[PDB]
Symmetry: C5
Amino acid sequence: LKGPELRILIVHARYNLQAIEPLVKGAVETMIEKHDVKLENIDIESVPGSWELPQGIRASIARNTYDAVIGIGVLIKGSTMHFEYISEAVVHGLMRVGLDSGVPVILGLLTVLNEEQALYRAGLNGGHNHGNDWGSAAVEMGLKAL
Amino acid sequence: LKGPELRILIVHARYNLQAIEPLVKGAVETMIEKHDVKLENIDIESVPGSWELPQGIRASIARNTYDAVIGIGVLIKGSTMHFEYISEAVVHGLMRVGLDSGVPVILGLLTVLNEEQALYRAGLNGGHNHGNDWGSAAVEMGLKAL
Amino acid sequence: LKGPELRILIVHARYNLQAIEPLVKGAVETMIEKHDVKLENIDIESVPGSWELPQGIRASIARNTYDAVIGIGVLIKGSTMHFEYISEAVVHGLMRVGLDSGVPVILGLLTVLNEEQALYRAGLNGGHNHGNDWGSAAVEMGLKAL
Amino acid sequence: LKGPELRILIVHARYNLQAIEPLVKGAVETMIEKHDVKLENIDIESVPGSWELPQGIRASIARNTYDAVIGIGVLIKGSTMHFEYISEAVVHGLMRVGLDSGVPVILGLLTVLNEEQALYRAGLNGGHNHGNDWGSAAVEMGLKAL
Amino acid sequence: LKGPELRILIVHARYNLQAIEPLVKGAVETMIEKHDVKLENIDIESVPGSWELPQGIRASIARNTYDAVIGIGVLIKGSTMHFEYISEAVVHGLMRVGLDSGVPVILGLLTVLNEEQALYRAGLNGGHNHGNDWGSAAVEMGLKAL
């Protein structure tokens, strides 16, 4: 599947930036290299933390027009219940923003127990970069939307 | 119950495709063989993963008109909390799309601990294929909708 | 409390039918025998499983007019997480249908660990039939709605 | 803070009535004795169980006009998962009714493991009556609403 | 990032006030000292408990106009399930108020097991004050909103 006429939005948080970057990259590289998406047609905005992902996307979805958007962030279990509650709220939030807007929202949220699990899913230490999967998903959902 | 005039939509994800296929088949075979549904009246679309099920169905529900739709996907517990969160969000999502649209949405989502449990519910290794149940359910809900 | 002019709707699923029936009966008998509800004023529709309860009620709530509705079904814990997710989604769903419509929705959903717990709450093996409680509740909420 | 011109609504369920009463009392006494609320300006309606709280409040909120409302009920853990699901649904429901209506809704819901824990929070056996806290909260939220 | 023209709202509950204060301070100090926010442009309202946070913010968001708002409160695990349910409901509530209003809502909610964990996250006993992070987040989201 190729989508030269597709406009894609990518919002990512900045916590655990060491895992975020590889993910964003994989997502971008895959879209371009494999689906023929134009670099100029890929906006990349960012927010403080995962909590802000739904809100950031909603805002951007209103300003311009995209065919698909990818929310990227990584939450790591800490000492309190904070992890559980943010996670649940953010995931429900992204789903809402997508269903309300009609714009496909790809889940690029990692909810892990430790940094290692994150890096592994970001393609480091022998793992498969999930940002790639997200990229292809964005493209597919974008086309089917039209 | 027979529904020759029924138009059914089936959206399924592609992860764990080995379990997905038997499910879709059972759903289709049952509708046809037991409820007299016309093969031409059964659309079968697909999306990347379960996360996209609600969004894919919403989109399709807007394009054409169906009497019932079946969402099919299988989520398997991994090393992180990802499974728990996607599961909860997807299930709430499908329920929403159905209640908002007024179109019956049948739950063909398997949330299992391991691949074996999935295959078993797909009719392999001595189990009962649940896609069959979903097929009959789609038909029943479709008629009662009219 | 008596409600001769009340119109009640009862939607029940068909899984674990052995527990369902006693429940529906108790609900009906109580409404009639104790609150003076007219048998002709009690509609009893049914759906495949608990998942369809919210959707079935929404549909019916649109076709006719009722003063109260009772959703009845029984979910039993199995080997997977399916039970947990359907349960949470269905309960949220019923609450939504009630709050959106303005029509009182009585919860006649049993979420048990095993069939015995269900039958017990259906009045068998020395237990108290909960359908009775639901019946009176339907009547009370119906009147206060007016 | 005093609110002589405030109209307060109090809906309470009737299960575990032994814990409910002390709670309602404390709420009323505190509002009057400490915030100068007029007894005639305090409506007290009731419903069967906690499940009906959101629905009862919605109904009443539509009939008349209140500055604040207090939902009171006590759920006790039993042998099944029923407790967990009603609890989650009711709490989400009350929050919704408040946010949709714009009318402050005070949470007077006790979700305990056993009757003792309930009575203790109702001021018996050496505990502090939480209904008092709820009363003051109702008054504060009511004024700030204006 | 600096936001001299930004109007920020801060609503905080009053339970566990010993942890609340340091948080509010850090939030204010950081906004001023590091982002050039004008003290006159920072409203600080308060409510009884965390349950009231969403409702308080909704009310204020309607009265005036803000570029960003910060909800602050701390919930501590007790003997009952109350903690879990308030937590889940409040977090979903804040997310809703933000998505409905279009106004960025920063999560300054601590859901801890004990007072120590709270104080630690408020900057005492060797910990980092999270109110600072929230302050910067408020500023960033506010600007991007424009």
